[PDB]
Design a protein around this ligand. Structure first.
Ligand SMILES: [Ca+2]
Ligand SMILES: [Cl-]
Ligand SMILES: [Zn+2]
Length: 509
């Protein structure tokens, strides 16, 4: 039998878990705690008329896709910002406390919904409106659709007028500086044909942040929404990186340092949240764990289970180009957080797109639960999964934290010390509520593929626990079901054997 010791000390290493790590980009069958309006379609979205452009995703079409996909009623298609107000209204109706709205920085937004934009209609042209961050004339709630410009501060003003500012109960809390700027010239060449420079990205980020914060001083600015590691390192070989990056280990440090400098000159914080996208490059069984992975490939599934360790564990070297060539930047979350500490202390960290794959397989659910445990433990502020409602095991992984009992039961909001003797076969995360250890929550993941694992728990707490109720999912179902409670707790010790490939949430009282 495989035997693993779990040691918890409810008084030790206490740290808040940000509530907003359990979010999504799409409409999921899960209770989520943040919603992001972002990704490729948001770069060219025009709040005045709701048109947007597919870019490379579909023939550079300008059309009504976001109206249709967001479920906006036809009677509101010509109402300013109806894509965004439907998106936020839906989030509020689902009791989601954080909405993150992407603002447009690549330079232009769709003028029309008339179909493909030719290369000869690359902006500026009749097919586009130029974005300015500051109107510099009085705002209107009925923006002028006939002129040549779309104003970001006027868009924010419309939202704040409707919902209140970000400090209020219904306000939109965060705005993103566009999406994947190092891919603008690939995804949106008809808006931004040139490869983005580091200098342009800082100039725009600073200017947009200033413009937003004049309207809503409480709103959080997120950037740069980088697509993946090569953008973290060099802004995708940006044309000015050889000069701008002198003395910087990677583009992340340059971005933090320059946003801090601009904030110090301005006299207020202009970057609230360092925002990146992380689609694992980890491979197993001869393929990446996401983007077309075969769920029959057991070696891929095993690699998916271990891949979350690249986020935090210095001993884990994944099979990928990042694991091979970029060891100096792994594990990735401590590297990002260390950069924040060195170059812009107090900046938060968000993972605004990610997907570990296997979302309809038990290993996608276990990996998802592991990732959410890591985000909480290591201090990520906000995270939003990218993927649809067919990812039933990913959704179970989210609900294990946000709604394990179907009536709103949730993981605690204060992380506490919880160590496993075998980080390969298992993960375990523990939390309490506020400062109170009366209820101790434990997420316990058995990564053993084809055998049970016996866990010997030893807990140091101010309480003497007498029952552990249990909810779990497994290969039999992604529905989270209540299991027999743990009852033989002797001096805050117990033994609990869990079947192969099972994810559990234990609630001790
Ligand atoms: Ca206009
Ligand atoms: Cl990018
Ligand atoms: Zn689903």
């Amino acid at each position: 039998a495989k035997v693993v010791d779990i040691r918890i000390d409810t008084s030790a290493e206490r740290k808040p878990i940000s509530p907003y790590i359990y979010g999504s980009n799409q409409e999921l069958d899960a209770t989520v705690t943040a919603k992001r309006f972002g990704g490729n379609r948001t770069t060219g979205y025009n709040w005045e008329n709701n048109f947007s452009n597919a870019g490379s995703d579909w023939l550079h079409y300008s059309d009504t896709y976001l109206l249709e996909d967001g479920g906006v009623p036809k009677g509101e298609w010509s109402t300013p910002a109806s894509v965004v107000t439907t998106f936020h209204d839906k989030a509020l109706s689902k009791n989601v406390p954080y909405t993150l709205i992407t603002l447009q920085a690549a330079g232009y937004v769709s003028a029309d919904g008339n179909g493909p934009v030719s290369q000869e209609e690359t902006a500026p042209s009749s097919r586009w409106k130029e974005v300015k961050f500051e109107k510099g004339a009085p705002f209107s709630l009925t923006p002028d659709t006939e002129d040549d410009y779309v104003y970001m501060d006027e868009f924010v003003n419309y939202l704040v007028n409707k919902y209140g500012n970000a400090s209020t109960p219904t306000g939109i809390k965060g705005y993103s500086i566009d999406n994947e700027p190092a891919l603008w010239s690939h995804t949106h060449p008809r808006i931004h044909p040139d490869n983005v420079t580091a200098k342009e990205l800082i100039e725009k980020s600073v200017a947009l942040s200033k413009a937003v914060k004049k309207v809503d001083p409480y709103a959080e600015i997120f950037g740069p929404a980088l697509y993946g590691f090569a953008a973290y390192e060099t802004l995708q070989s940006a044309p000015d990186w050889g000069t701008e990056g002198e003395g910087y280990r990677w583009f992340i440090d340059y971005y933090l340092d320059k946003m801090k400098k601009a904030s110090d000159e301005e006299g207020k914080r202009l970057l609230d949240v360092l925002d990146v996208h992380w689609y694992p490059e980890a491979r197993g069984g001869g393929e990446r764990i996401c983007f077309g992975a075969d769920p029959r490939n057991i070696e891929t599934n095993k690699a998916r289970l271990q891949a979350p360790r690249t986020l935090w564990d210095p001993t884990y070297i994944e099979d990928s180009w990042i694991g091979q060539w970029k060891k100096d930047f792994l594990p990735i979350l401590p590297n990002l957080l260390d950069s924040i500490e060195k170059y812009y202390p107090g900046t938060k960290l968000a993972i605004t797109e990610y997907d570990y794959g296997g979302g309809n397989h038990i290993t996608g659910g276990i990996a998802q639960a592991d990732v959410l445990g890591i985000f909480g433990k290591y201090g990520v502020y906000l995270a939003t999964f990218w993927g649809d409602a067919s990812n039933n095991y990913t959704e179970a992984g989210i609900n294990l934290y946000t709604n394990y009992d179907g009536k709103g039961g949730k993981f605690g909001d204060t992380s506490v010390k919880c160590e496993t003797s075998d980080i390969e076969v298992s993960s375990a995360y523990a939390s309490i509520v506020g400062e109170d250890d009366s209820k101790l929550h434990i997420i316990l993941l058995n990564k053993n593929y084809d055998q049970p694992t016996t866990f010997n728990f030893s807990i140091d707490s101010s309480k003497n626990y007498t029952i552990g109720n249990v909810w779990a999912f497994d290969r039999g179902s992604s529905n989270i079901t209540q299991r027999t409670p743990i009852v033989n707790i002797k001096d805050n010790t117990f033994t609990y054997t869990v079947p192969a490939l099972t994810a559990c949430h234990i609630v001790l009282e």
